Amino acid sequence: MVQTKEIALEQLALTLTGDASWSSGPIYVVCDVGGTSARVGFSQASQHDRSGLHIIYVRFKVTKSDIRQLLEFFDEVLQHLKKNLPDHGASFLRRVASGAVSVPGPVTNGQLAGPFNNLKGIARLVDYPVELFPKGRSALLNDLEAGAYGVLALSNAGILSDYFKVMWKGTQWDALSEGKPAGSTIGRGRCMVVAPGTGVGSSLIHYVGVSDSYIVLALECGSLSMSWCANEDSKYVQALAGYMASKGLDSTVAPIWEAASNGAGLEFNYAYAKEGQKASAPLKSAPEVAKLAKSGSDTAAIAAVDRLYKNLIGLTAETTMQFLPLTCVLMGDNVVANSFYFEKPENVKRLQARLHEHAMERQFKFLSRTTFLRQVSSVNINLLGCLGFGSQLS
């Protein structure tokens, strides 16, 4: 499985010297930024068909609310290794196969992470310690790009089924699976990744036959306009649009798919199902609605959740058609937390029903080719993705 230990910076060399696994094999430098917290550390695999992935990280605090503070952190790690390893961390650093930083903001060509709304400064990959971020073997990653690499990492480790469950198997799985069971691997094909939460993240693991390797593309599929529709479905999109305007934003402008599939949307859904076409005020927060839905009481909370995932799947009907993926993965803390919804066969059936409303499934059965998976176990997917990135390097 995935073993993750957070350690004090002072305990780093102690931890590295304490477990001989660290003494051999490639080392993948991992780092993720989120909130006031920059976790910086190291990852490696171990050769099995149950690979076992290990991560060790130090949690640093962004005390200046400034992304350039990563430089201080990398130097503290580096100076600690030279000061607390017998060979100045020579034998360790020579095995660094890659370095990656997952950041919660826009990223340019994996080389520059642009303005953040709540942090100062620009992340520039070139400014980073070459010993932690080897030339030509390093990148800044979008949060969802890193997450997708994490999925791949889990897959290559043979451990996908411990963290993900099959929602439904696509018609094209067996033909492409090389004899492997659905959910055992993402397999040799595209994997479309969507992650609902505050916003709705997306990314694509693209499989490359020529080199038998994968590359992840960061995406903004949550920001695709909702699809046209009529009647009751259209009344909802209309209400969502007007709500989102309440920026030359009209109620005549389509709202983005994210708005119907995130926390904000869940809160809107609750109002909409109770009265809604009335007080735009949601009152109940997304946590509450979901808890109320899990309980089974509040009929409106249940409908609001149902509409939430019906529309999340509606977004996936679009992504499934555009990318024709072997697999589509629904992930993130919210998907794990709302496992109760997907544990009901009737619900899964109705979700697959929704996917199948797309014109291209109706006419040509394109979308049903895709195997859908759901995250069930929490994990530091973004840290793992820093390994996933490194593992795909030519």
Next chain:
Amino acid sequence: MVQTKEIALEQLALTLTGDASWSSGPIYVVCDVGGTSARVGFSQASQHDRSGLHIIYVRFKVTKSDIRQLLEFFDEVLQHLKKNLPDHGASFLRRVASGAVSVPGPVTNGQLAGPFNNLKGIARLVDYPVELFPKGRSALLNDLEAGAYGVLALSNAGILSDYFKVMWKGTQWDALSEGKPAGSTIGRGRCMVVAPGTGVGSSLIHYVGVSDSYIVLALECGSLSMSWCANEDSKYVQALAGYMASKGLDSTVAPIWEAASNGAGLEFNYAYAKEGQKASAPLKSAPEVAKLAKSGSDTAAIAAVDRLYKNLIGLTAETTMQFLPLTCVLMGDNVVANSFYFEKPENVKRLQARLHEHAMERQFKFLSRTTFLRQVSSVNINLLGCLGFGSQLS
């Protein structure tokens, strides 16, 4: 410039021994299958600031209407080189750097290409002769995947501007252009490629900072459902939906973007403009409509063509948001043939305004970052793309 020359198979050797510019340097095998022909040949670069790209090809007729007949053309090409070149073509064949086959259908992992609409059989890369298609160095490419590589080959040759013009320059161009003017190159950034016509093809040139290279992803963005809208726009989407429902479809099932931006949709658009809303049949075919629009002698034809390209742009608003590309290229014979529309500044600004209607432009100006280009001159872009493909190999 681009130098492309069809020859008969009997002339292959004398062509390659005639001009000495085939005597040295990498050779990229090219092949494009279209309608009733399979062009098979050889391509190379040259050394200029404006590179110079050379393609020599033989046009085989797929008289068996079977994709497997490719194997016969391939052998004919090989046998000819063995019989007529000094050394059984061994010196020339030794220099084959890659091989690629552009096919008018969906490709699986670059290795298999599927049922086609008017060719029996499955294209299997594993079955192609290694001398033309070296192991680890070859791929089947979809139509627009090859086309995108062709754009890239032109850009890298420094000759993009002889084939493409700027429609509008993006706000992010200067920052990412490295001092190069808009239109002189695609730049170090994502290029979204769209090609309307009989259908609407799409592909993405993705830039990889780590490797300073590109990879093209085939796409089906033409099959994304049209975006939600209201008022008169929703009236048109509803009419189009019913028209396409003339497979289980209703006028409540969203039509795909392709349907509002292709030849068929143009024919619908004219009927819609002239009859109005209860339109149910073409009245005039796509080229007459475009001719009438170019004359300005038919207001409905002007209106049908205006709607067609506003909707093509509507499609590109969603692709522009999803992929946030540095450039978007509109290309293909239809874009070239309807140059008259794009040649009028008043139209180009209309298109750009349409682009800017997206919720994500109105709010955050995401869409205006991108530079839009259009094809102005014909070129064998798919064969060029087989070279583009070879040029990006690791």
